[PDB]
Every structure is written in C-alpha cells, then in structure tokens.
C-alpha cells in the first residue's frame, strides 16, 4: 500500500542493505511512488535519500505476514538522472574558447534572448534553415535555438497547468536563459566578426573590466566592422 | 504597493491599451510582479493575460491621490521568451534525415537516455571532450548532452523547491533527446548512410504484416 | 406533381415507348424527381428503371384535364453519362502489371492504409511535393493519395444511427482495399524497382495458387537484393 | 456484450487515460464497434471521442469481479484515417498549375462529369486503354476516371441499403473530379501552355467589372 | 495649463508674428497640442491657423506677471507635413506610362483590391517574397502591397477606438492602390508594351460615341 | 431591415453554420450593413464576427411571415480579400537587409519625415523625376514618397473634436515611423553605398544590444570614407 509502513520497511531494509554492502550512507525518509504488481509480487518503489544531506531520486526493485516473512532481496539500484557530470563537456572547448574565458564578460552583459534570436534570424536565417552544415557555429546554433524552443514549451506547459508555480517559470527565464544567452552571443558573434576577433575581444574586454573604475577608459571595447 | 488594487487597474489599463493599439484581444487574469521606480512614477509591470486557452506572461512598461490622477501611458507590451515559432530548423537536415524519418520508427524503439549516455561516454568520451571539430556528429552530440544536463539540473531544482514535471521531461523532451542521441551515436558508429538506410528499412519492416516480412527485426551491428 | 399517378403513367409509357423504339428489356418502379417547365409541360423525369433488374436511373424529358388528354412522346431518356465504365481502364496496365496479376494477393498482404501513407510520406515526401514528375509512379501516387483524402473527407462528413456507421465501414474496407493495392504497388515499385515487383507478383501467384499441403509453409518476401 | 455498462466504463477510462498521456479535451459519446476476446480478456474497442464539437473515429485497447480486479492497460489512441494534413500534395503542381490558379475559373465553369467523360472516351479511349505511358496527363487521367468509377459504385451501393449522400458525391466530391478531368482533357487537347494562358486570361475576364467585360467569355480553340 | 487664456493670447501673438514675418492671412482658431516646460519657460505650442477656409496643422514656439514681463520670442511657423507639392513624382513615368495615360481607363474599370491581391498572391507570391530584384515591377509591386497593408491596419485601428473614415480609405485611397496594382500585375503578366498599347486601345474604345463602339470592350489576353 | 432581430438571427445562424461546416472558432455581435435583393431575398450580410476575438468583417450572402419560416443556408461568407497579409513581404529583403536588421535602431535615430523628404528632394530630385529607373532604390523611394503623400491627403481630409486630432497623431507617428525607416534606408543606401549601410546596421545592432554600462558612450556614425 502507498500509506502503509510496509513499503517504508521494504526500502529501509534496502537502505541498510546499501550501507552494509557498498559502504554507503543514505537517509531514506519517505516514498513518493511505490508500484505494486503481482506475478510473489514485483514491487517497484523509488527511494529518496540524503547523500550527506543532499537528496537524490533512486529506484528500488525488490523481488519479495505472507508479504513480510518471504524471500527478500533487491536486485537493481538504478538512479534517476545520468546528467551528473559523467562527461565534462565544454560548450566552447572547440572553437577556441573555454567557459571561464566567457566569464570575462559580466553576467548582465549579454543581450536578451529575443534580441539575439532577432539577430540570428536577421543575418543567418537562410543558412540556419538549410540542408547543409555550413560551419560548426551553425551546427551549434541550430541546437541552441531548438534547446531554447523546448525550454519555452516546458515554460508554457508549467504556466498553463500549485498556484505559485510562476517561480519555476522565473527560474527557467533567468538561470538557463543566461547559458543560452552566452551560447547564442558567442556563435552569432563568431559568425559575424570572425573567430579570432571574438577570442581577442574577450581578452581585451577582460583587461577593461579588470581595472578599477578610477582608471578605466570610458569607452569599452566593442565588436564592430567600421 | 505589491498586491494593491491600483496595480490591478494598471494591468487592466495596460492590457486594454495593448488591445486597442497592437490589435489583439488579451484577457488579463493576474499580476506576478510590480517594480516601483520613482523619477511621476515609472512603473514596471509583468502580467499574465489569457489568450485563447493559453495563459502566457507579458512584460509591461507604464509611466504614471497623485498616482491615479495622472497621465498613464503604455510604452511596451513585449512577451517573455522569443519562441513564437519564427525559425523552422530541423535538428536533422544538415545530415540527411528529417524529423519525420525519425518518427517513422516506433516511439519505444529508441533506447532510454541513460543507456545512450552510457553508450556515448563509453565510446567517444575522448573526442566529445577534446578541442576538435572531428565531425558534425560530435558537434551536435555535445550540445545534445549539455542540453540534457541543463534539463536534468532543472528537474533536480524543481524537486528541491516549491512531481508531474519530472516525468513530463522524460516523456516529451526525453523522447526527442533519445532520438537525437540515438541518431548521432549510431551515425558515428555505423556511418551516416547506413543509419539513413536502416531507418527506412526498419520502418517498412514494422509496417508489413508479420507473415510476409523477414521474421527477425533488423539490427545494425558489426 | 411528385407522388401523383400522372408522373408514374408518364414514366410507364416512357419505358414502354423505349421498349417499342430501341428494343431493350425494361421495367419501372419509381420516379425520384420530376421538375416541370411549362411553355406543354417540359418535364424532367428522373425515373429509376431497370435495364437488367437493377435500380439505375433514367433522366427523361417529355412534352405534355388537358394534362392527361394531350400528346405524349419521348425525345430524351438518357442516363447519367458513364453508367458503369463505358471505357475499360486498367490501373496497372501502363506499369507492366494488370489487375489479374494483383488479384492473387490476399486481403491482408497489404499494410493498413495509414501505414502505406506514412511510408509514402516518410520515404518520398520531398519527391511527391516537388513540381517535377520524376516518374509515372509518383504521378499515380499523388493522385492515389488525393483520392483517398477526398474519400476520407466524405467519411468525416457522413459522421457529421448505424447506417452512417456501416457507410464508414464500407468506405474504409471495400474501397480502401483498392487504395491499399494501389499504394502498395506504387511505393513498392519505387522502393524495389519495377521488374522486381512484377517477378515477385508472378512467384507469389505461384505460391498462393498451390494448395496448402504442397507449398513451402511461408510466403515469398519482397526485397531487392 | 456490446451495449452494457462495462464497456462504457472501459471506454471512459480509456478516454481519461488518453487525457493523461496526450493531455487534450476528447469527449467520449458512444462505442462504435466492440470485440470481446478471451486470452485475461482482450478487447478491440472502437470508441468515438468527440473533440470540442467535431467528431472523428478513434480506437482503444484496454486489456482487463475477476475481470475487474486486474490491470487495465491502454496501449493506443490511434486515429482511423491519415487525413490529418500530414502531406500537402497539389494535383496540378507537377503540371505547371496550382489550385490557386484553378480558382480563377469559378465553380460552375466546369462541364458536367458526363460531358467530360465522353470527351475523354471519344478522343483518347485508345490511348487511355493502352499499355504504355504516352504522357503524364494520361497517367493522371486514368486515375481520375477510375476514382470517379469508385465514387459511382459507392453511390449505387448506398442506393441499395439503408438518401442524400448520393448527391453529396456528385456535387461536392464530383467538383474536384470535374476540375481534374477538365484540366487533363484540355491539356491533352490544346497543349499545356495554352491551358495555363487560358487560366490567366479567364482570370482577367472574370476579374473585370461587368460594365467593361466583353460578352464573349474566353474559350479554348485550335482552328 | 492647456485650455486657459494665456496660451490663447500666446498663440494669437504667434500668428500675428507669422503675419509680420511671412505676411499672409492665417486665422488662428484653436490650440491643438500644448506642452509647458520650465527652463524662463519653454512651450511646444501646436496651434491651428486656418488659411482662408482651408485647415492645416501648424506650429509655434514662443519662449516667454513674471512670465509675462519677459521677451516673448517666436522662432518658427513650420508646417506638419511636406505635401506642399515640393516634388512631382509620377509613379508610372519610369515604366513608360503617365497618369494622363491611365485616365483613359475610367475609375470603375479597375478590379477590386481583393481580386488584384489574390492574382498577385496566386501568380507571383514566390518572387514577391524572394530576396532578389527580378524586375522594377516587382520592386514597385511589393511597396504597393505593403502600403495597402498599412492602410488596412489604420482601418482596423480606427475601427477600435473613437465611423466613415474606414470607407474613405477603401474607396478614395484604395483607388490609386487599385491603379498601381492593376498596372504592375498586368505589366508582369502581359508585358509592358502590351499594357501601353492596351491603354491606347481602351482610350480609342471609351472615346467613341455609343452608337459605333463595339460591345466587346478590349481586354488583355495572351492565348 | 437593419436593426431588426431577423438580420441578427440570420448572422447568428450564419456563424453557427460556419462552425458546423468549416470548423473554426467564431462568435458574433453586430451586422453593420445588410442590403437586400428580392427575386427569396439575396441578402448582403456584412456582419462583423470574431475569429480570434477581434472585430473583423464577414461579408455573407443568404437565400431566404414567410421570411422567418423558409430555407436558410449559406453559399457565401467570405471576408475582404487580404485579411492580414496573406503574403508575407519584407520591404528590405530584396535590398540585402530585413526588418529584423532595422528593428534595432531606436525611434529617434531617424530625422523627421520632412527632413528625410527634403533630403530626398534636394539631393536626388533630378533622378527621382526622370523617366529612367537608374536603381531599385529610386523605385522604392518614388513609391515611398507617393505613399506618404497619399497618407498626408488623408491627414488633411480628416481635419476637413479630439477624435480626428488623435487620428492625425496616429497617422503621423505610428505609420510614418515606417515611412521614416524606409526613407532613411533608401536615401542612405544611395548616399553611402549599400554594403556600407548594411555594415552600419550590423555594428549599430551590436552597439544598441549592449547594456549602457559596457559600451562606448556614443553611437556609431554613418559616413562612407
């Protein structure tokens, strides 16, 4: 049952099983989902546990009076979410940059997502929507635009459907929007001005933003062709 | 004031001003934000206006005892997020496929995203992490993996704040990331033309009646 | 009028006068519509009358108190154009095959019409929507897809009792099996070549004509190789 | 059974499962067809789920006291008919025209289906029955003749067992047959470029106000 | 303020200062707009000065007890709108015609704006949306379509906040749009010299008395 | 009539019949004009009805004491032609640029339309009045000048309360900003060359997209050099 304590005893036996076999320390405290399925039954539970205080959604799968004093052994302990830095991929390791080279510019230096998308559809709409990879900045820019598209359909999903679920809309509109603004800015600018120009402009704007306000020249470096 | 009636009247003035000027019909429901800036009061409203069955947010800039007895005037009603469908981009058009060719295969054909990320990290990790454009498949694979990373980071954020959204991600964005990861991993392994032929072969194999096709499903291997 | 005995007598003497003049076997039941044009009434006798026993239509036109006792004579008795196929066209005869070559394939050899349409779309959509011909198979495929679409708008329209529910059943199975044969033949002649599909239909005819006891237990499969 | 309460509850459960997986407003009204098969009991449930006032044939498959204490599992909400606009074929686009261009010609410009079928059977019956491709217009004309044949056999079928659907075909579905037959007969008779220039000049004729249009509407001729 | 006596005396002083510098008969009636800015106090005075029965929007700028014991200094009497006939552009003169020549055709010869816009969207929509110059007629036709778009958005704007100005556009400003659309669609379809000879021959047709003109008014055709 | 409930019932059953037949969302308030043609009244139902909530027009035509109890059916429901731009034309797309490239320039970057017209006149009047093309910029410049002139005759006509005073304000600012963008773009592409104006719009977009804190304090200037 969902409310009964037998699922809690089941995944609690699973969690001290873990702390015995794999030198683990997890604090299973509650169950959101615990499926029941008869074949002996085939339970499917998820166990949420503090990992040094940090929560993580796992999945429990144990082949089990008659449901407590039975043959009891877990077989799989698969967690939910492989996106845990298991590959440290840098979006800008190709093309010459790094991530921390793109931290020379401040956070609110980048244009909006609307202004960058108007820029991309201004100068490069024919080359983006095209049956050829023109250049690697296009292959990255197409994926960046579609990623922002599916993020905004998720935003209108959670906006259409408790009642204070606008905070997640603000979270996607800012915190992932910043990464997509950097990733759009970098590729539009490397397409327009050349890749060496953006990479040395990043250093020159770095130097400009290093210096204190009393000694900073009043005209920042800027990308131009004039 | 952050929850007054005057910001609600300002939101009604903004929504009927946009309705009269830019020729739309937006039914305002609720306000989510109001930033006061004294220079005359320069307000900064963001309100959600119901539109045809879709509750969507809208940023506003109005400038207005002394507050309501003043010349209020709307300067901007642009929405949030540019995704109104202004670019038609396939993820698979520079490669030779289309999106309909990858929905030719069944939905549950594609291995789950855990298995595909393990397949990617077990086989191309020293090229998906190196400073080269080895191929466009690597260049699209990197952005697909990092987009899934942002999506799962958002999933753990919503879990640790405020669920149906965590499985909504896996049903909807998970299927497109499964097709994308499958396509690029298989195109790196077996070649691109071999995957483009396998797609139509497995498609027409799953369409035929079972008594008139080869009995075992197509696999691609070496 | 419409339900009067005068229109029925008009049509009775019409079918009997056809029996005098042009000598075909004919009998009559019902007029479905009789418009009038008085100038001497130039009737429009859309009368159903049986050449061969069946309820087919004969639009007639006669020159007729005084409406009974006057001259009655036929100048027009013609049906609606192509009665049952005045020309005998074979939809595969230009492509090598015939209908007699494809009448051996069973009713469930063909995938469902959604699956044939999805195969056609998802495998040749850029060539079925181009302004070029590129093949006669693409031309017949375009017309076949549009004919099925026109028929599906009818299937939607009739849904707007069980009468409409069996009309949808008719237009999905009975016609629709012809759409599936046409769609299969054209996307298979494009996929595998055309001589390969004709050789496959020959050898599948040999397989399906054999009794179940004296043939290999599973049908030939189509693939180009 | 077919008309009892269990398949109604099963179809309502299937339509709310569809509202869980695809998240729409599908309103179930009546079960169309139903098959009850033992295996555990399998069902081939043809239900009708109305969509905001429009009706389309849909399907359900929910494998189910002993049949009700079981895992009720839905697998599909497939449509019956692939006419969801998934492919936009233009029947004239391969021939230089479009349906934008054949609406210069009004609805009642076109000759009747009888008058076009006997023009085809008078002028091209040898080559519309011959085993070669003489043109793309021949291939496109054979199909239109045969599709009218299927429409007429559906008309005489529905006139045998049960109204006004017989004159839904001959007008509303017969209009596009008349357009196709006119276009292909006229392109075989007068040439293709002559039919395109005729469509343009008939657009100029029907475009002008009635005070200044000439009374002789433009016509195709060769002599 | 806006409606008091000081801006009325200020506007009358501005209009007699205009009668001192340009020496005409401009009759001030009412202040249209007014802005009061401190500096000494600056004014952006939009006054209306009627000119012998005709009205045109004009402007005044008179920089002024303490505000009235000051040097009241006018600097401009500028018009609002450069349509004083300062440049005489003919929209057809680059194409061989003139508006003297397109008045052979009467007012109601021209097809409606709908019937010309869908002829353009049926026959040239690919090249009227493509990033190259295919002709001067294409460049001249894109602008006429977009100017009709601006006229229609002004029509639906004035139909949202407040009459009969909505049918001032569609008739009186729509007539020149119909003339431009007819001229450019017909020059793209039939050639340019054919449209000039058609204008000449329609002048011959509408010129003759009704006893001897043929009933078929001349028409453009290619077949 | 005009204000009768019969015309409103005609238009109500018209919009409901559109909902049955062609399946669009629709609701109705007002008929603005209903002409009549009796032969059986062939009405001209210029009824405003909302596809999407807005007050757009539907000119309809119906065949209808006996005027209530008769057959009512639609054969015509069409709006006025180009509803909102059936074709999507970009006024700068042939000239290299787009509207997305020029939407970054602020509203006061452009000189007033008198100053752009005086620049056009006093700098290219002999070439804007010649019978030669000489450029597509001259062609678009001629049409832009004439469009503004036609709009200014309307601004004069509406002046012949505050309603006309805000209509003149609309036609001077809202349209008129488009005239200023068009006039600026064409006289600047003629003055400075065309690639120079496109490069200037790129670099001005970079300047205006930057926040005020992280850009040089004054905009790029346009000159050929």
Numbering used by the authors:
A (entry chain D): 14 to 52, 59 to 83, 89 to 185, 194 to 258
B (entry chain C): 14 to 52, 59 to 83, 89 to 186, 198 to 257
C (entry chain B), F (entry chain B): 14 to 52, 59 to 83, 89 to 184, 194 to 258
D (entry chain A), E (entry chain A): 14 to 52, 59 to 83, 89 to 186, 198 to 258
Sentences reproduced from the published study:
Here we describe an alternative form, termed N-VelcroVax, a VLP vaccine platform assembled from a monomeric HBc protein (N-anti-SUMO Affimer HBc 190) with the Affimer inserted at the N-terminus. HBc protein monomers comprise either 183 or 185 amino acids and dimerise to produce structural subunits which assemble to form icosahedral VLPs with T = 3 (90 dimers) or T = 4 (120 dimers) morphologies. The dimeric assembly results in the formation of 4 helix bundles (spikes) which project from the particle surface and a sequence at the tips of the spikes comprises the major immunodominant region (MIR). The VLPs effectively bound SUMO-tagged Junín virus glycoprotein, gp1 as assessed by structural and serological analyses.
